[PDB]
Ligand binder design. Structure first.
Ligand SMILES: *C(=O)[C@@H](NC(=O)/C(=N\OC(C)(C)C(=O)O)c1csc(N)n1)[C@@H]1N=C(C(=O)O)C(=C)CS1
Length: 244
């Protein structure tokens, strides 16, 4: 395929421009990282992981037998931020809905001490979870888009320090799209910040031939933006690059 890199860069930049945001999307092919978008310097800047952290939370909870993948976490009947969360769900259904209350229960079964240890051990982001287990994913923990794409790469290839089966079980929770033979695995994130909001979509493409291409989209979310913009820009970018 004969599109210039200049034209790729301009197309992907324009997807962020057209959404009235600032963002980057990092792509990893083998050992090589590529940075695209309209704010490239976001790539080695730190932001809260927000719900991208559900990936690690799940890994920790399963590895330490705080939950199983078929277990049903019951809605306790209290009003929840979103009505779609007002139902009983497995970790996998909760991942798909990004249901904080399930993931908070799981973090609390894991407990603050074991959670610090696991986060220090996996070297995730700046590895600081502080002293609130229920909610540290508002500071102190932060991570860069480069770190996130490298986390995705690890997970996709079963390199994190967890059992193979723990990693497969979590990967299975992350399937969000199939497109022309390709599978996209990823987790979204939307954090409320200092003065802005961060938007994430971190995962990988599994192509028919088996090659895995990790990515991490990171942009600033604004009032009146739908969450699915993160998806649209991701799919467009990966399509532009011929990854899907
Ligand atoms: C994961 O990212 C979740 N996000 C949050 O709980 C945070 N903020 O979310 C609210 C205030 C609901 C928001 O919509 O901005 C958050 C966590 S740590 C931090 N500093 N802020 C759930 N995930 C998503 C997602 O897209 O994955 C949501 C749409 C909101 S809830």
């Amino acid at each position: 395929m004969h599109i210039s890199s200049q034209q790729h860069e301009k197309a992907i930049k324009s997807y962020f421009d057209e959404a009235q945001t600032q963002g980057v999307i990092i792509i990893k092919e083998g050992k090589n990282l590529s940075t695209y978008g309209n704010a490239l310097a976001r790539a080695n800047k730190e932001y809260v992981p927000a719900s991208t952290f559900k990936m690690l939370n799940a890994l920790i909870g399963l590895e330490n037998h705080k939950a199983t993948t078929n277990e049903i976490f019951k809605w306790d009947g209290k009003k929840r931020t979103y009505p779609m969360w007002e139902k009983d769900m497995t970790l996998g259904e909760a991942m798909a809905l990004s249901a904080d209350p399930v993931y908070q229960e799981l973090a609390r079964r894991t407990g603050l001490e074991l959670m610090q240890k696991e986060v220090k051990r996996v070297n995730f982001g700046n590895t600081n979870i502080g002293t609130q287990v229920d909610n540290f994913w508002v500071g102190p923990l932060k991570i860069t888009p480069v770190q996130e794409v490298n986390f995705a790469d690890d997970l996709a290839h079963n390199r994190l320090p967890f059992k193979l089966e723990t990693q497969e079980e979590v990967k299975k929770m992350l399937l969000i799209k199939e497109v022309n033979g390709s599978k996209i695995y990823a987790k979204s994130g939307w954090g409320m910040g200092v003065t802005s909001q961060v938007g994430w979509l971190t995962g990988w493409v599994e192509q028919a031939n088996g090659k895995k291409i990790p990515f991490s989209l990171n942009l600033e979310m604004k009032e009146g933006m739908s969450g699915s913009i993160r998806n649209e820009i991701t799919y467009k970018s990966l399509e532009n690059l011929g990854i899907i």
